[PDB]
Amino acid sequence: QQQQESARRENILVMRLATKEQEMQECTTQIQYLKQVQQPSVAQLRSTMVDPAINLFFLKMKGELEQTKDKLEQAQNELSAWKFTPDSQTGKKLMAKCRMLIQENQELGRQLSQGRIAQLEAELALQKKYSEELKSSQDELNDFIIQLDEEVEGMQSTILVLQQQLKETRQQLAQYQQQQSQAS
Amino acid sequence: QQQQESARRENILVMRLATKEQEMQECTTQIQYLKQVQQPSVAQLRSTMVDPAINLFFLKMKGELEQTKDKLEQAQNELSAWKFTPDSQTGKKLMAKCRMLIQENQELGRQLSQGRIAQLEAELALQKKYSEELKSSQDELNDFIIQLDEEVEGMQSTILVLQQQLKETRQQLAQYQQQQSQAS
Amino acid sequence: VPPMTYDPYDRELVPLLYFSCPYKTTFEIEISRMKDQGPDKENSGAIEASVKLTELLDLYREDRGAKWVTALEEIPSLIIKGLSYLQLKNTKQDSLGQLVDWTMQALNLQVALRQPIALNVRQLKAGTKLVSSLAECGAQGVTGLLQAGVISGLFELLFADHVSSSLKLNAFKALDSVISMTEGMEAFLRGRQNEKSGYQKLLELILLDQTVRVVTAGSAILQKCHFYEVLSEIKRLGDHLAEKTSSISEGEIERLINLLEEVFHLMETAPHTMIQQPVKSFPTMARITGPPERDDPYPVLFRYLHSHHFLELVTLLLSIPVTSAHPGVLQATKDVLKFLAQSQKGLLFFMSEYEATNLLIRALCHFYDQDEEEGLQSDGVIDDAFALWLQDSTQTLQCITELFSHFQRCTASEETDHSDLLGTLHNLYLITFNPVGRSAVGHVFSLEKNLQSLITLMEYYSKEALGDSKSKKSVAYNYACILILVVVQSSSDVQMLEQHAASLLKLCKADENNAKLQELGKWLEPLKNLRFEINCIPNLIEYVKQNIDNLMTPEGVGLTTALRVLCNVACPPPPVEGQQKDLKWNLAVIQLFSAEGMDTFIRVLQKLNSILTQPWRLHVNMGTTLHRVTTISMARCTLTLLKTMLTELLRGGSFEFKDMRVPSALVTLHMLLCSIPLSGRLDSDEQKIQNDIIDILLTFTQGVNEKLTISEETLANNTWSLMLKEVLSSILKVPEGFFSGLILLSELLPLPLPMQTTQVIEPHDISVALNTRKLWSMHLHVQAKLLQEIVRSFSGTTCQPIQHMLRRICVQLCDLASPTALLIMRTVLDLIVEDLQSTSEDKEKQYTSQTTRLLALLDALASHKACKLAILHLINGTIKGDERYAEIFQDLLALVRSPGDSVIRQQCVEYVTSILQSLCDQDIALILPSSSEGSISELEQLSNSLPNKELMTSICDCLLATLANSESSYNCLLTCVRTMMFLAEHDYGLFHLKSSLRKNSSALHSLLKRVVSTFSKDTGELASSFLEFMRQILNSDTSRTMSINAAELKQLLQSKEESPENLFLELEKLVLEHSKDDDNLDSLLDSVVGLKQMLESSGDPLPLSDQDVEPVLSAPESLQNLFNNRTAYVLASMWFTPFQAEEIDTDLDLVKVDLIELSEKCCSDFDLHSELERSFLSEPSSPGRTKT
């Protein structure tokens, strides 16, 4: 039928136009985000601090100052190193710093060695084993809880049966005590 | 069921789609324009508007850079003044050793708190926390089981007292029945 | 023909078509289905059970033996089918009545006492199961039970002596089933006459000694009774408010807000405190025993809400003029509505009660009109989108029901009417245009197997063709593809994908040449053969670390899904009050750490802040909402993963964590995401990110005890000091981060004391808060050279947000302890003195605008309790090297004594006089003034609130000089008369003021001449303040032992004998000031006429009293003791937002003309910047993975 395919074509155009309205929404919200109503304060902040030229210049200046400072301190300690000599305060301090760094490097080496990693792995395995031991204990505890509830239910049932029998005996005794007294 | 109305609807739909698409073109040109019009140049970088704080930072960094440069040149000429001596050479060698030690000590210290032997310690601590939480929960469940067991003991005592009452009443009833059955 | 112009509120709700009502029980659902559907395939399945039921109640009509007990255990399985079928067939023997008779016979203790050995307790539990199965049977069944007295029959099991606990717990489960229905709940709360109600019996039962699980069940029933009582009280309050105003009290509105908040907090903790836990499940601290299944209490909470008409009530409240005006009613109501709309059950509650829901939506929309009318929605009043979100959520669930009910009608044929299907899909697609509507569509399709409505939709049209255009484009297929793509993209909750990943991947694979299906398949890369448990954490982490390079490249878009899933299966939801912790969340974190998870989340954060860093600078903030949503979801999932890996690791026991890649990356991600919101306020998704950042950084503070702080060589290497170093060094790193670091440090640092709390607090919390502040001060005093640089750098700036946040930091950071406040205040005062001696060396003092900005900073700080005392304990001159501060304060006082004609000095003198006002303000102190007990005596309090006697004499002389000066401004005069008012409130300052007037006897005369010579309708404030102070010197002769009489004051008012002339001129100037605009004119008139009456009531010439007892203050307590003894809690503009409209940057910020290009050759050489910035706008201009 000519109407069915015509309606399908209309559906095609409506689908395309719906996607077009989606892109309208995206572009218009991007416009509203770019040209948003903004305070003077945020514009000042983004034009004075977040200014790309100022940021790049500040980063370059900070980097250059850091490099110059590190080179200066290197040169100062190094000229102290030509001033290194035994039995002098500079010499004693410098050699003591070197030995302290030897000791610290040895400590970091023993704290990073494969032996210490294996020790920590063994401790982790022991902790895991303790965890499955606790879980097995928890399973046993659950079984104990189940058996305790079953015992409680059985005890209540036999309590009720005992109450039944005790009643029946009590009324039988009372009725036969009233009954047998008439023959005295 | 007419086809002329369907054809007219299709034509108006495609016209609306074309209008929406020319709005696509205009809006996307506006998006492309707004997103990249911030052209810097040289004439407006000779007269950059900076905040007083930013200008003060630039002045402070420039001054500190100037003193660091001049004292670094002084350090270099002082290095050049000194001549090679065995103490100076051993000091230079040991200072190079010290710098290498500091570098590799920082590297080892950032491997220790970021590498595998930090994830291992985190795993160990978390496993200990999980095991202690599970053990505390099991300890509380043990007190709950103690409550259930004391309930069991109470019901057992009730069973015993009801059984003794039943026994005494039953024997009393039996003796009374075979007592007054003969005296009637 | 579906129209493209979408009005979000042109569609209303209609009755539920596919999903059943959430509050309807199984029996009511079955009976409605069998009433409207009629005969069906399962009608035979109902009849074989209905015949068994009707034969089963007939074969046992008088027998109560073992076989009867066995039948009692088979009745519950036959209830839902047989009873409904009999009720529909109009049974003439009252099957429900016979079932209730069986239930009550079984539940009695005197019928159990006639049974065999081991089936009497079995009879009792069968009876309680029948109670639970007949209470979930509708109003008919519940009323049939209650008329037989099931509450009084259930409370015979509970009160029975020597009965089991697993039987009393089953009886609690049956009582909860009975009270779940509203009729049973009413019969429980308000019991029969001449009998105790069920509530009283339950309370008496709880007061006994019983097993922990039994009392837990009792508390669970009581917590549901409390919820029902709160709902009924809300109903009564709403009725009062809707009947009084329709023809009002504030208490009945504050209580209503509190009750709505209680309803919300009871629905949060409903699945933990309102449910009956299983018989084998104990209330341990962490769930270790019992079945893992727990029935949800929302199907009965919604019955309570509907029986009380909660939606109609909130509609009334949101439409009553007095209640609509309150901003707390709306927030409290919308919290409850948001919680309801979060779930599938709650959203079906909204849709089932559609008549009330439509009016609720309309009322919320009219609030969006009311906020538009007020115009305050820009700030303060949040830009709420809840009305549109709820409308879109209910509408997309309505469309989901329409989709589902369109496939039920095709279980015996094939689809032929697709106009309705395409209309539904189109009206659902246009919901996905707004970000709010897109979020709603992504949310609703992720709830309880809703995405199947579209998965089956494409599975049906995978048979007509491949899905693309061969003979027809299959428009429904394209709509389904787009809708599944947008829900997968926008839904942060990924529980749907757990069960739909296989189907979605099959759909993507079966049609390889679709533009949307390829992207959907790329969105589901991590979910190929994945089980969504804690054991697949290594797989997800391996996926995230394998393609971390393609972070936001549209090829590695599935990494967002991998992080959403990994945050869904390894991050617990925010814990609520009463919830017992599941132990699988600890195993999730252990697995998240076993596989490298700290490395592959820090790396995700580093890549994210390395990609976002370039567009952020160039004012490109992820324009497209798809990319915005993807980036926000990625950041939030990574932050949640890091938080749950750090909160569960850095808590309780001290564990060293010196990674320092988390804070150094979070200080940058905060810059890129939460630093400069262009809307002036952080939205709903960039505030969760900021809160996550704050929590992760604060997790470096927890776990630190008072043993790592004993030694300074261990204090500086702590896991807290290192975090503080990484946060403080990242502030002065880049000027773009200047504001970000400040706004981050303002959240890290603790709030200023005292806390504003509505209730009294135990001293333990006061002690822990003071200890936290002391620890913060200790960990910040090791970064003294960084705080000094922060406060020396941003001081003098003209960027209003940065200056505001700097003076907020210097308020938070001086409220911690004495050292960290003295540090900042020494820095500020030394900076002021070095600025004043920077250009005035060997010369008289010269003031620039840097000085006035610096003084503005000092004054903004000096108006606070701790900073004022830090100033004071430096400017006294106690020997610690503090002579410079005393000299500079004397210099400021000399400045105020002689301001000059310069326009910048006139702007500094107002700041200095405001500083003087703040210092002399008694109310601004650590020890708040209080004559009663709880604080030191007032005379002993003025020694920690006011300067010493020499400084007080100097300040008094300065105030008199600036009052007598004819060049002084108006704001400075107002501030000085306020300061005189402050000093006139106590004998000490008033004595110093009085002693100052003898060396300057023309000060009052000069001030009065100044105020009467230039009096107008706007300068009347100064006159009113002067008259108030004028009375404050005379309000004590009617009190203060130190004062003056009228005679000496009148003679002090004159240097030439013309004081009556000035007083008269002031009197008749009020008449010509039209004396009618405001009551301030009348107040000033009465004050001036009273003073005029006192003028002629005593002889004027009488010199001021010379010798009298001098009030001497006590020695000033050390600042460390004042901070320790400070009032930590009290019973109860700068903090609302940093982007102030205008405080300093009014129109002239003194931007300095900086010559960057020529300032480059002097320093290290560097090429022209212009090409550098222009190279950044070509490739990384569009959102995506940027080259830099």
Q: Report the candidate in C232, C339, B169, B159 with the shortest Cα–Cα distance to residue A171.
A: B169
Resolution in A: 3.0
Kindly state the greatest CA–CA separation across chain B: 144
In a domain, C1010, yes or no: yes
CA angle centred on C126, ends C120 and C130, rounded to 5°: 145
Instruction: Look at residues C480, C487, C488, C471 and name the one whose alpha carbon lies nearest to residue C522.
Output: C488
Confirm if C615 and B155 have CB atoms less than 8 A apart.
Answer: no
Cβ A39–C733 below 8 Å, yes or no?
A: no
Q: Is C284 on the interface with B (CB under 8 A)?
A: yes
| B4 min Cα distance to partner chain A (Å) | 10
Please indicate, yes or no, whether residues C1076 and C987 belong to a single structural domain of this protein. yes
Residues of B within 8 A of C795 (CB-CB) are: 53
Q: Are strands C581-582 and C286-287 parallel, antiparallel or unpaired?
A: parallel
**How far is the C-alpha of C631 from the C-alpha of C650, rounded, in Å?**
27
Q: Using CA atoms, how far apart are residues C1134 and C10, in angstroms rounded to an integer?
A: 43
Q: Which among A37, A55, A163 has the least Cβ separation from residue C735?
A: A55
- Any chains having at least 3 CB pairs less than 8 A from chain B are A, C
Work out the angle between the directed axes of helices C883-897 and C818-836 (0-180°, nearest 10): 60
CA–CA distances in Å: residue A97 to residues A93, A103, B96, B97, C831 = 6, 10, 13, 11, 37
**Integer angstrom CA distances of residue C904 from A170, C219, C852, C929:** 110, 71, 7, 37
Residues on chain B touching A127 (C-beta within 8 angstroms): 124, 127-128, 131
**Which residue, C778, C786, C777, C857, is CA-closest to C825?**
C857
Chain-chain contact of B119 with C596 (C-beta, under 8 angstroms): yes
DSSP string, C249-316: -SHHHHHHHHHHHHHHHHHHTHHHHSS---TT----SEE-SS-S----SHHHHHHHHHHTTHHHHHHH
SS3 label, residue B124: helix
What is the distance between the alpha carbons of residues C411 and C400, in angstroms, rounded to a whole number? 18
Element (H, E) at B49: strand B48-50
Rounded to whole angstroms, the Cα distance separating C693 from C689 reads 6
Task: Please check whether residue C445 lies inside any domain of the structure.
Answer: yes
| Residues β-bridged to residue C757 | C1131
CA distance B100 to chain C (A): 22
Yes or no, beta carbons of C162 and B155 under 8 Å apart: yes
Rounded Cα gap, residues C356 and C350, in angstroms: 8
Last residue of a domain, one of C1081, C1112, C1143: C1112
Short-list C666, C659, C722, C672, CA closest to C695: C666
Q: Do B176 and A172 touch (CB under 8 A)?
A: no
Rounded CA-CA distance C1161/C768 in Å is 56
- Torsion, Cα C708 C714 C719 C721, to 10 degrees, reads 110
- CA dihedral over C114, C119, C124, C127, signed as positive or negative: negative
What is the CA B21 to chain-centroid distance, rounded? 46
C841 falls within a domain = yes
Q: For residue C80, what is the DSSP state?
A: I
Q: Which residues pair with B50 in a beta bridge?
A: C1152
Residue C17, domain member (yes or no): no
Cα within 13 Å of Cα(C1015), Cβ side: 23
The answer to whether position C187 is within a domain reads: no
Contact partners for chain A, using 3 or more CB pairs closer than 8 A, are B, C
Task: Name the CA dihedral angle for A93, A98, A100, A101, rounded to a multiple of 10 degrees.
Answer: 140
Cross-strand bridge partners of residue C755: C1129
**Is C276 among the domain residues?**
no
Q: How many domains are there within chain C?
A: 4
Tell whether C739 lies on the interface with A, counting CB pairs under 8 A.
yes
Chain B residue numbers with beta carbons less than 8 Å from the beta carbon of A134 are 131, 134-135, 138
**Domain housing C1083:** 959-1112
Q: Which residues, including other chains, have CB under 8 Å from residue C766's CB and lie 6 or more apart?
A: C1128, C1129
Q: How far is CA C284 from the centre of its chain?
A: 31
Could you tell me the residue ranges of all domains in chain A?
1-34
Q: Give the A:C interface size as CB pairs under 8 Å.
A: 168
Q: Which of B113, B121, B141 sits opposite C282 (nearest CB)?
A: B141
| 3-class state of residue C62 by DSSP | coil
Name residue C582's beta-bridge partners.
C287
C353 in Cβ contact with C13 (< 8 Å)? no
In this complex, the residue of C586, C661, C1177 whose CB is nearest that of residue B114 is: C661
Same domain? C934 vs C967: no
Helix (H) / strand (E) element for C755: namely strand C755-757
Distance from CA of B85 to the nearest CA of A (A): 8
Q: C891 and C985 share a domain?
A: no
Flag whether residue C212 sits within 8 Å of chain B, measured between CB atoms: yes
C368-405 b/e (C-beta count within 10 Å ≥ 16 → b): beebeeeeeeeeeeeebbbbbbbbbbbbbbbbbbbbbb
Give the other-Cβ count within 10 Å of C999's Cβ. Answer: 11
Beta strand ranges found along C401-544 (DSSP E): none
Q: Do C997 and C895 reside in the same domain of the chain?
A: no
Whether residue C797 and residue B41 make contact (CB cut-off 8 A), yes or no, is no
Answer yes or no: do C820 and C938 share one domain.
yes
CA distance A72 to B75: 7
Cβ neighbours of B34 in A, within 8 Å: 31, 34-35
C9 with C393: CB under 8 angstroms? Answer: no
Print the SS3 string covering C1126-1166. Answer: CCCEEECCCCCCCCCCCCCCCCCCCCEEECCCHHHHCCCCC
CB-CB: which of C618, C734, C799 is closest to A45?
C799
Domain-ending residue, one of C1096, C1112, C1128: C1112
Same-domain pairing of C1048 and C1015: yes
Among candidate residues C290, C298, C289, C293, the one with its CA nearest the CA of residue C269: C298
Same domain, C994 and C938: no
Buried b (16+ CB within 10 A) or exposed e, C61-99: eeebeeebbebbeebeebbbbbbbbbbeeebeeebbebb
Query: In chain C, which residues have their Cβ closer than 8 Å to the Cβ of A160?
Result: 112-113, 115, 120-121
Chain A residues near residue B149 by CB distance under 8 angstroms: 148
The structure was resolved experimentally with: cryo-EM
- CA dist., res. C598 & res. C1076, Å (int): 72
Helix axes C662-674, C599-611, angle to 10 degrees: 40
CA distance C1007 to C205: 79
Residues of chain C contacting B65 with CB distance shorter than 8 Å: 1163-1164
